[PDB]
């Protein structure tokens, strides 16, 4: 998933009017004679940033053959400050696209449900819903400790392909604050948190 194109021409045409960025409004725009508007064949990545350094306008772009992944294509794009490189994904039938999945109809990277599925007096099974590009989370950090004072909160990470976790070795009768941080690939920062309370 989700939107897929039968060819490079068709991918290019779609991303003239739909952003290539999940957060910003960045549309593909031709480099400023009689040659192909945007394909540059087997040309290197340093070179692609040479052809795009001289563009002031957002969305300047070419598509080159990929260096690190022969037979694949790369899409190079100017984003105000920097030159960004996209990998052109192919699916099972060899359709082309840029992003697996989609937002949730959501505008934030914070997990949206966080719930206790089942519980004993010394353990928790919890679940959550990441709807914003779940395929792009590298891992979740789960923290838990007594609500209020005092000691170190306990932490562990579960892989991004996971939607549930198990918390163990808890004291009966204690109120816990349970929190989850999403770490997208590759955001600089964890996403901001979502937490829950539960008393064993």
């Amino acid at each position: 998933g989700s939107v897929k194109f039968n060819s490079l021409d068709e991918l290019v045409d779609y991303h003239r009017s739909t952003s290539v960025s999940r957060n910003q409004q960045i549309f593909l725009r031709d480099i400023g004679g009689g040659g192909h508007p945007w394909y540059k064949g087997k040309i290197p990545r340093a070179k692609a940033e040479e052809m795009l350094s001289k563009q002031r306008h957002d969305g300047a772009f070419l598509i080159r053959e990929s260096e690190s992944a022969p037979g694949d294509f790369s899409l190079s794009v100017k984003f105000g400050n920097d030159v960004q490189h996209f990998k052109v994904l192919r699916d099972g039938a060899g359709k082309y696209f840029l992003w697996v999945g989609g937002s949730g109809g959501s505008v934030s990277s914070v997990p949206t449900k966080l719930e206790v599925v089942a519980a004993t007096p010394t353990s928790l099974l919890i679940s959550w819903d990441a709807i914003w590009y779940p395929y792009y989370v590298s891992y979740y950090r789960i923290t838990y400790g007594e609500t209020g004072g005092n000691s170190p909160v306990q932490e562990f990470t579960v892989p991004g392909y996971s939607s549930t976790a198990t918390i163990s070795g808890l004291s009966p009768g204690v109120d816990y604050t349970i929190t989850i941080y999403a770490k997208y690939h590759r955001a600089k920062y964890y996403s901001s948190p979502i937490s829950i309370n539960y008393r064993t």
Binding site: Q84, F86, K87, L98, V100, Y135, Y136, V137, G160, H185
Partner: peptide, 8 residues
């Protein structure tokens, strides 16, 4: 070798 739309 690193791309803006990579996977984990």
């Amino acid at each position: 070798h690193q791309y803006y739309n990579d996977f984990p």
